[PDB]
Structure formats: structure tokens, C-alpha cells
């Protein structure tokens, strides 16, 4: 019932107790492990509320104080009456920060407590959403000195009146059908680019066209807005050694900002809660550039390096992959946009695991996502046993809204 | 019930029914996933069910389920168990058994090859000397002057747990490590403890960076005995680089035959605690793990110094760069000497093909992602994007505790 995790590199052994407060389910059973699958009202609300406020009041050293008991009654009175309730600012800040703290797939969690929270619960329209978002993007960007932040739109009610950002990130490039049978821009975004075009966007049809935000307020049809160009910090990609690199025409954006998830605090669901921090290099260099189903550029790069592409065993793919990632890091650093490499990121996450075992009794971690998609075994996370379990407050996936919302 | 797995690169969707024949337990629950934890006498009562299950499986595969010959064999095993408490496998069953343990190893990327496996039956073996002889022949047959052949040698099964056959070496061929009084290590730091025990048992250590350890063998529950593999049986490749001429002066070499000797093979409820098997390397097992783990040979600094990489900031990606050149070197060297080896691109691609055929023909393929995906270049290999189900079938290879931890010394 107490569980040991060992690090096979350093022999350090940790004891996890935090898992016993695990609440949600994993997908695994004693018969079958699903570790590698990408996705495995009135009655229920008060339990969820209570469990949250309990951890809250414990966290501020007020467990069992009168202020504690009073809030618990206040919230119960509100639910019995209004079939829902509202969070205090202090509660909301703590909930958001803890959803980040509990994100088992996030390597960057040493930072969890430095999160600027923007309370946008007073928002009512899609134009209001847009204003909030622009302010978030500008505050977060900070002329290259990136700062973590999240913006929280009003919470779900009867699920007939959801707030949703339709984009998956705030900033993403378009992807287009061609007669060629090929793909122009980012293939990740084809379908969404077409929901744009069909809702009205005039697509410039380039390789790196910044997508229009698509915002939905109080369950209404969504509306299109272009983030001001001057707010979208982008980075031209060059290599510190190869002068030809820049002729590939590569650029990436500086701000990673996931916008499609759902934040759950104390039973309440926040369906629009865009959040953002800063990139680990490999997310752009390995995934964005080199995945077959993305910009898929290895072939073009290797050629320019004049490597022997005759046999997989010359490791030309691997050689080209390292250079691309060297070019990503170098470009962001030279333009002074914040970025972290995988060595530094993982080394920080291991220090953060230790702190969290020391100070909280554990740290939920999904090894499959924490280990970088290149050079796994030379980073320390590789040798570290991890335990994966679901705690609340949390971020969760939710179905794409187009499939769902009635048009 | 049906479980679906998706490939995120190709959109290929597969259906597993095979997980429905799973018995042993994973270590995971509905509340905790242990998918990244490394290490998560049988009475008569359980033995016949286990025998029966195996024998039903065996008899299905040869298309004689329900035959008279199937019925009679269940009867005969039945009797042998009630009378002697154990039973003996036919050759045919043992071979089928050992092939399936491989086929069921979910941590093994090499399984496309599972049906081509040479089985050496060493169950007449009675002494340690006898064990030497069997193992030398395995190594010679498997080696084949560089054209590697997969093989397994199976020594007599567990009886009362007091008369166990064990190979104390974790692999038949591995290098000694020595811990120095200054605190540093010479040779392979991984084998320090085992090296210590061999010294204790009378081995005269050369004390080099690449001394082939002696075999240390336990027959019939007796104290283990030392033996040196004939050096002419031990194929080695010195490592050099196609473009970097200073690479050879690093002094690196490795052996050709990877041969796991510390696992326990389970078939029909019987336990074969000495069952060393061997195939051929994927390059990254040497070039990533053996050379570049901090806990192993750890040659990253020296390699990148010599390549003159900027080493003052991890963000130059100098480690990633040195790591690639070493791996190019390992593969170049094995190929030049004509010693069988597979690169990680080719190995994962074959695997995905095997995995698909297995779902089409067998209704599944248990697979552990943490292990299947290579420890360099993860996402440019097709397994990264592959969803996988992990569960346990028998026959199977299992871990067993190191024998110096359990052995009762006779003196
Ligand atoms: C400060 C710098 C940050 C770094 C370096 C970082 C790093 C990462 C990385 C590399 C991933 C995997 C991405 C992928 O391969 O798709 C990830 C996932 C995630 N991170 Fe972060 N993160 C940062 C900030 C944040 C913030 C501010 C939040 C929320 C407040 C957050 C919450 C999450 C969540 C929920 C996921 C996984 C979502 C899922 O299940 O798909 N992270 N993080
Ligand atoms: C044909 C050449 C083969 C290749 C290229 C290959 C590949 C691999 C690799 C790379 C590993 C993981 C090693 C590591 O990363 O630490 C592995 C694990 C394993 N393989 Fe193979 N394999 C081969 C043949 C075999 C054979 C002949 C057997 C036995 C019949 C076998 C059974 C296993 C088992 C049981 C494991 C799990 C090890 C553990 O849990 O510690 N493989 N395979
Ligand atoms: C906040 C943050 C910081 C940071 N450095 N990185 C991230 C992750 C971002 C950057 N790159 C990918 C994005 O993560 C999203 C992962 C979700 C993919 C899973 C998915 C969701 C929905 C539909 C799918 F088909 C597949 C987030
Ligand atoms: C048959 C075979 C073929 C092939 N290509 N690879 C393998 C796996 C081998 C090759 N490299 C390591 C080994 O896998 C097991 C690794 C376990 C870690 C070392 C260890 C294991 C057990 C006890 C120890 F003290 C130390 C096996
Ligand atoms: C803790 C973690 O599971 C452990 O380090 C695993 C990770 N994946 C691995 N994968 C392979 N192929 N071999 C290994 O030794 C390991 N080690
Ligand atoms: C199928 C498998 O779960 C999938 O490829 C995962 C593997 N690990 C990952 N790790 C990260 N960080 N991001 C991902 O999108 C994935 N994809
Ligand atoms: Zn699991």
C-alpha cells in the first residue's frame, strides 16, 4: 500500500503515499496495462466540493478552523439551492496551480507555483473572450521573457451554455488540402483550417499562416478573430554552423498555449481555460518538424548535409534530427525568446520529483510522456521509475466541440 | 470483449482479443499504473491446471485439439503428477514451449524471429562441468563465425527448489568491472559485484578494461564452479568510425553474442531456472546503453572532446551529437567484420510488421512500450507512435533473484 520508486542510475529509492488519495481511474487493470494509450449534477457535486475545500484549508494550515467549517456550510447551502457554486479567488488560484501540479504528463512542473491566473469568470461574449486572450498572449509573451499564465472563462452550467476555445493552441499554423495530393503547412490542423474557411476566414494559403482564434461564449455559435500580428512573437530558424539552414524557410512561434482542455476544480468544470508557459526544444525540433504527419523535414535536411541516405544504418535520420534541434535552440536563444533543452528540463523534473516526495509524499508521472522523444536514455528521467495516477484538481481532455455543439 | 489500439502516424487501428487468455498479473490497478516499474515447489493442486492449459494450447497449434493423442497425453501427465508430483515435457512440447515464451516476451523488439529458434535440450545434464560443455557448444553454434543464429539451451527443471540448476552470470559473455580504492571503476561498472564473487571463488583477474568474465555454474543445487570460455569461442569486434580516424584509439571493443543467462523459463507450470538464450544485437544496446550510460562505460565526455564540440552548455546538444557518432561507429564496425547486427530503424520497422501480422493471425501481441521504443531517437522510429497492450501470456520468461542472494552454501 506504500510504494517504492527506484532510480536505476543513482540507486535513490522514494516512497509514494500520495497515490492513496488517488481519485480518478487509469485505464489499467491487474490483467492489462494501458500505460501507452493516448486516451484510455446535484448528488456528486458536494462530495467533490468538500474534498477540494478540505485540501485547500489544510494547505493554508486552517484544517478544522471555524473559517473552514463556515465555507463548507456556505458551499453546501449554495448547491442545495442553486445546483452549483462559485469559488473564491484564493480557491481558484490554488485550484489552477494544483491542476498544473497534478499534470502527470508535464515535465515542466518545477515551476507549478509561478502561474499567473487570469480570472475571466465575468466574461459574457466572444468579443470579451478575444480581449482576455490578447491580454494573456501579451502578458505571457513579455517581449520574449516568457511567463506562465492561464485564463479561466466561466464554468459549465447545464452544458448547454459552455465556453469553448475551438483552437487546440492559441497560436498554430494552417494546413491545406492540395490537388498535388500533398500537404501545405501543418498537416495537424487541416480539418480545423477547413472549419475556419467554412465559418468565413480568408486563408492566405501559405506555409506558416497563423490561424484565427475561434471563440464560443455561453453556448453560442463561435466567431473568428485574428490575434494582432504584433502580438504573435515568431522565430526564424537558423543553424550556428550551416549557413544554408535559413534557406529552408523555417519559423516557429514562441508561445505554447494549450487551449482545448478542461480544468476541473472541486467538482466544477472550466471548459475554456487556455494556458501557456514556454517550449522545451524537442517539442519543435523533434515533433513539429520531424514527425511524418507534421512538417516531416528530415529528408530535405539530410540531403543538404550530403549524408549517405542509401541505408538506414548510416543513421542519417538521427544525424539530421540532432542538427534540426540544435538549430531550434540556437535560434530562440539568439532572439532571446525563452526555451529549455531536454537535458536541463529533465534534470529539473528529477529535482522536482525529489522535492514532491519530500514535501508532499509523491508525484504522479507518466514515464511515456516525460522521457524526451530523442536521446531518452542520456537524460535522467529515463532511469527513474515513475508511478502514474490521477489526482484532482486536474486538466482533462474533452471532445472537440465541432463534433458536439449543435450548430 | 475487444480492445482497440491506434497508430497515430498511420491511423491504422487494431483489435486485440488475445488479452482474454491472460493469467499472470501486471502490477497495475484501476488506480495506479506501474507500467514503468522495472521489477513489479509448486503444489500438485495448481500444477495440473497449468499443464492442461499448456497442453490444450500445444494441441490446438498442431491442429489436433480433442484428438485421442491429446486426450491420452492429458491422462498421462495427470498420472505422472499424482504419482511423482511433477512431469516431463516431450521434446516437441519443450521446443514449442521455448518458442512461445519468446513470442510472448512483451519487452522484446526482436520477435519477428520468434519461430526460428534453435533449441538445445540439456535436461540429461547433471554436473557443472557438463553445463560448461553444453554452453560452449551453444556459443559456438550461435556465433557461427559472425553469421549469428538464435538459440536456447535448457537445463533440468526445478524440483523441490533445493536442487536448482543456475548460471550465475547475467549474460554468458560480459566484461569484468573492478572498483578501485580511489573510488573509480575499471571495466564495466555493472558487473562489479559479480566480478567480486568470481575473484572470491578463485578467478585470477587480468584487471583490464575488457576481461571476459568466467562462467560460474550451479548444477543440481550444488555450490557453483568456475570455468573460462575458450577465448577462441569469444567473437569480438573492435570499434572504429568510418570518418573519424581517432575513434579506434579510444580502445573500445565489444563482444558479438548477447546471451541472457539469468531468466527463468516457464512452460506448463514447470520452472527451468537455467535457460540461457541468445540472438544478435540491436546497435543501440551497445552504443547507447553499454557505452553511454553514466553507470556503464560512460564515454560521452571523451568522445565529444575529440569531436571538438562546444561542451560549456548542455544546449549545444553535444551529448546528443557524440551519442550519434558512437552508434554510427558500433554499426559500421559490426558490418565491416560481418558480425550480425540490426540498427534501431530497421528493428522497429520489422517489429511493427510482426506486431500487425500477430494481431491478424493470433488476435494480439503483448508489447511493453517503455521497453520497445529505443533509447535514442525515440520519435523518428515507428513504434513511438504505436499504441500497445501489455499483458502476460505463458509460456514465459521471468525474472528470478540473483542466486548469491538465495543459495544455501554447502562448502
Ligand atoms: C514552463 C514551461 C513548461 C514546460 C517546459 C512544459 C513542458 C511540457 C511538455 C514537453 C509536455 C509534453 C508536450 C507534448 O509532447 O505534447 C507537457 C504537457 C503538459 N503540460 Fe506542461 N510545460 C510547461 C508549462 C505548463 C503550464 C503553465 C501548464 C498548465 C498550467 C502545463 C500543463 C501541462 C499539461 C496538462 C500537459 C499534458 C496535456 C495532455 O495530457 O496532453 N505545463 N508539458
Ligand atoms: C534476434 C535478435 C534479438 C534482438 C535484436 C532482440 C532485441 C531485444 C532488445 C533490444 C531487448 C531489450 C534489451 C534492453 O533494452 O535492455 C530485448 C529484450 C528481451 N528479449 Fe530479445 N531480441 C532478440 C532475440 C531474443 C531471443 C532469442 C530471446 C529468447 C528466446 C529474446 C527474449 C527477450 C526477453 C525475455 C527480453 C526481456 C529482458 C528483460 O526483461 O530484462 N530475444 N530483446
Ligand atoms: C503549456 C505547455 C508548455 C509546453 N512547453 N508545452 C506544452 C504542450 C503543447 C506544445 N506542443 C503540443 C502541446 O501539447 C498538447 C498535447 C495534446 C495532443 C493530444 C491530442 C489532443 C486532442 C486531439 C488529439 F488528436 C490529440 C504545453
Ligand atoms: C537474446 C537477446 C538479444 C538481444 N539483442 N538483446 C537481449 C537483451 C540483453 C542485451 N543487453 C542487455 C540484456 O537485457 C537485459 C538487461 C538487464 C540489465 C542488466 C542486469 C540484468 C539482471 C541482473 C543484473 F545484475 C543486471 C537479449
Ligand atoms: C525505470 C525504467 O522503466 C527503466 O529505466 C527502463 C526504461 N526502458 C528500458 N528499455 C530497455 N529496452 N531496456 C532498459 O533497461 C530499460 N530501462
Ligand atoms: C502511442 C504513444 O502513447 C504516443 O506516441 C505518445 C508517446 N509519448 C508521447 N510523449 C509526448 N511528450 N507527447 C506525445 O504526443 C507522445 N505520444
Ligand atoms: Zn498500467
The phi and psi torsions of B404 (rounded to 5 degrees) equal -70, -15
Long-range contacts of B245-249 (CB under 8 A, 24+ apart): B246/B306, B247/B325, B247/B329
User: Which strands sit side by side in the sheet containing B270-272, from one edge to the other?
Assistant: B270-272, B264-267, B396-398
Q: What is the three-class DSSP state of A7?
A: strand
**Catalytic residue at A78?**
no
The phi and psi torsions of B117 (rounded to 5 degrees) equal -150, 125
Given a contact cutoff of 8 angstroms between Cβ atoms, the answer to whether B216 and B197 are in contact is yes
Q: Is A63 annotated among the ligand-binding residues?
A: no
Residue nearest (by alpha carbon) to ligand 4 atom 15: B260
Number of Cβ atoms within 10 Å of the Cβ of A122 = 9
Query: Of the residues B107, B119, B370, which should be mutated to test ligand 2's pocket, given the most ligand atoms within 8 Å of the CB?
Result: B107
**B395: exposed, middle or buried (C-beta count within 10 Å: 0-12, 13-18, 19+)?**
buried
Given a contact cutoff of 8 angstroms between Cβ atoms, the answer to whether A379 and A371 are in contact is yes
Residue nearest (by alpha carbon) to ligand 6 atom 3: A36
Identify the CATH assignment for A16-121+148-158+262-276+346-370 out of 1.10.10.10, 3.30.360.10, 3.90.340.10, 3.40.50.2300.
Answer: 3.90.340.10
Euclidean distance between CA atoms B378 and B320, whole angstroms:
13
- CA-CA distances (angstroms) from residue A303 to A217, A297, A298, A306, A321? 49, 10, 9, 5, 13
Residue ranges of the annotated binding site of B for L-arginine are: 171, 280-281, 285
Euclidean distance between CA atoms A21 and A46, whole angstroms:
17
Strand partners, B278: B151, B259
**Extents of the domains making up chain B:** 16-123+150-160+264-278+348-372, 124-149+164-235+399-403, 236-258+281-346
Q: Domain spanning A234-256+279-344 has what CATH number?
A: 3.90.1230.10
Q: What angle do CA B246, B251, B257 make, to 5 degrees?
A: 120
All three cell numbers of B385: 507512435
Query: Of the residues B118, B149, B170, which should be mutated to test ligand 4's pocket, given the most ligand atoms within 8 Å of the CB?
Result: B170
Alpha carbon of B5: minimum distance to chain A alpha carbons (Å)? 7
Euclidean distance between CA atoms A359 and A361, whole angstroms:
6
Cβ partners under 8 Å of residue B72, min gap 6: none
Fold category of B124-149+164-235+399-403 in CATH: Nitric Oxide Synthase;Heme Domain; Chain A, domain 2 (3.90.440)
Helices (H), A117-222: 126-141, 190-199
Residues 52-111 of A with CB under 8 A from B: none
Given a contact cutoff of 8 angstroms between Cβ atoms, the answer to whether A45 and A267 are in contact is yes
Per-residue burial over A187-225, b if 16 or more Cβ lie within 10 Å, else e, is bbbeebbbebbeeebeeeeeebbbbbbbbbbebeebbbb
Partners of A32 on chain B (C-beta within 8 Å) are 3, 19, 22, 26, 28, 389-391
Resolution of the PDB structure in angstroms: 2.2
Residue nearest (by alpha carbon) to ligand 2 atom 19: B108
- CA-CA distances (angstroms) from residue A14 to A352, A355, A359, B401? 13, 11, 12, 21
- Method used for this model? X-ray
Q: Which CATH class is domain A122-147+162-233+397-401?
A: alpha beta
Angle between helices A89-101 and A42-59 (to 10 degrees): 90
Half-sphere exposure of A280 (CA within 13 A, CB side): 23
Comparing CA positions, the residue from A346, A341, A347 lying closest to residue A281 is A341
> Does the CA dihedral B176-B178-B184-B189 come out positive or negative?
positive
Euclidean distance between CA atoms A300 and A247, whole angstroms:
11
**Domain B236-258+281-346 superfamily per CATH:** Nitric Oxide Synthase; Chain A, domain 3 (3.90.1230.10)
Q: Is B236-258+281-346 in the same CATH topology as B16-123+150-160+264-278+348-372?
A: no
Cβ partners under 8 Å of residue B382, min gap 6: B7, B9, B348, B349, B352
The phi and psi torsions of B150 (rounded to 5 degrees) equal -75, 145
**A231: exposed, middle or buried (C-beta count within 10 Å: 0-12, 13-18, 19+)?**
middle
Q: Which CATH class is domain B16-123+150-160+264-278+348-372?
A: alpha beta
**Catalytic residue at B280?**
yes
Angle between helices B44-61 and B91-103 (to 10 degrees): 90
Annotated catalytic residue within B73, B93, B108, B254: B108
Comparing CA positions, the residue from A290, A260, A305, A252 lying closest to residue A374 is A290
Contact call for A33 and B36, based on CB within 8 A = no
All three cell numbers of B291: 557505452
Comparing CA positions, the residue from A76, A30, A32, A24 lying closest to residue A53 is A76
Print the SS3 string covering chain B: CCEEEEECCCCCEEEECHHHHCCCCCCCCCCCECCCCCCCCCCHHHHHHHHHHHHHHHHHHCCCCCCHHHHHHHHHHHHHHHHHCCCCCCHHHHHHHHHHHHHCCCCCCCHHHCCCCEEEECCCCCCHHHHHHHHHHHHHHHHHHHCCCCEEEECCCCCCCCCCCEECCCECCCECEEECCCCCEEECHHHHHHHHHHHHCCCCCCCCCCCECCEEEECCCCCCEEECCCHHHCCEEECCCCCCCCHHHHCCEEECCCEECCCEEEECCEEECCCCEECCCEHHHHHHHHHHCCCCCCCHHHHHHHCCCCCCCHHHCHHHHHHHHHHHHHHHHHHHCCCCCECHHHHHHHHHHHHHHHHHHHCCCCCCHHHHCCCCCHHHCHHHHECCCECCCCCEEECCCCHHHHCCCCC
Amino acid at each position: 500500500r506504500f510504494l517504492k520508486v527506484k532510480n536505476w542510475e543513482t540507486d535513490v529509492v522514494l516512497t509514494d503515499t500520495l497515490h492513496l488519495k488517488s481519485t480518478l481511474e487509469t485505464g489499467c487493470t491487474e490483467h492489462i496495462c494501458m500505460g501507452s494509450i493516448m486516451l484510455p449534477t446535484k448528488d456528486q457535486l458536494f462530495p467533490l466540493a468538500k474534498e477540494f475545500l478540505d485540501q485547500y484549508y489544510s494547505s493554508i494550515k486552517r484544517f478544522g478552523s471555524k473559517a473552514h467549517m463556515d465555507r463548507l456550510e456556505e458551499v453546501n447551502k449554495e448547491i442545495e439551492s442553486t445546483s452549483t457554486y462559485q469559488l473564491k479567488d484564493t480557491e481558484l488560484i490554488y485550484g489552477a496551480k494544483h491542476a498544473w501540479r497534478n499534470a502527470s504528463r508535464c515535465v515542466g512542473r518545477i515551476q507549478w507555483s509561478k502561474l499567473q491566473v487570469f480570472d475571466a469568470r465575468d466574461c459574457t461574449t466572444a468579443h470579451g473572450m478575444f480581449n482576455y486572450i490578447c491580454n494573456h498572449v501579451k502578458y505571457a509573451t513579455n517581449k520574449g521573457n516568457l511567463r506562465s499564465a492561464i485564463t479561466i472563462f466561466p464554468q459549465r452550467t447545464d452544458g448547454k451554455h459552455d465556453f469553448r476555445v475551438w483552437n487546440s493552441q492559441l497560436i498554430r499554423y494552417a494546413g491545406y488540402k492540395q490537388p498535388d495530393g500533398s500537404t501545405l503547412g501543418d498537416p495537424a490542423n487541416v480539418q480545423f483550417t477547413e472549419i475556419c474557411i467554412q465559418q468565413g476566414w480568408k486563408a492566405p494559403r501559405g506555409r506558416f499562416d497563423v490561424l484565427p482564434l475561434l471563440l464560443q461564449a455561453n453556448g453560442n455559435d463561435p466567431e473568428l478573430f485574428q490575434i494582432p500580428p504584433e502580438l504573435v512573437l515568431e522565430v526564424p530558424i537558423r543553424h550556428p554552423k550551416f549557413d544554408w539552414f535559413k534557406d529552408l524557410g523555417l519559423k516557429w512561434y514562441g508561445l505554447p498555449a494549450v487551449s482545448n482542455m478542461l480544468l476541473e476544480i472541486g467538482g466544477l468544470e472550466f471548459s475554456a481555460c487556455p494556458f501557456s508557459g514556454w517550449y522545451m526544444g524537442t517539442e519543435i525540433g523533434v515533433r513539429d518538424y520531424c514527425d511524418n504527419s507534421r512538417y516531416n523535414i528530415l529528408e530535405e535536411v539530410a540531403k543538404k548535409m550530403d549524408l549517405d541516405m542509401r541505408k538506414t544504418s548510416s543513421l542519417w535520420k538521427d544525424q539530421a534530427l540532432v542538427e534540426i534541434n540544435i538549430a531550434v535552440l540556437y535560434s530562440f536563444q539568439s532572439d532571446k525568446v525563452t526555451i529549455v533543452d531536454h537535458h536541463s528540463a529533465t534534470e529539473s523534473f528529477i529535482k522536482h520529483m525529489e522535492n514532491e516526495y519530500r514535501c508532499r509524499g509523491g508525484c504522479p508521472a507518466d514515464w511515456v510522456w516525460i522521457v524526451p522523444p530523442m536521446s531518452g536514455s542520456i537524460t535522467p528521467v529515463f532511469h527513474q521509475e515513475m508511478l502514474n495516477y490521477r489526482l484532482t484538481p486536474s486538466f482533462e481532455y474533452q471532445p472537440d466541440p465541432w463534433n458536439t455543439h449543435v450548430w
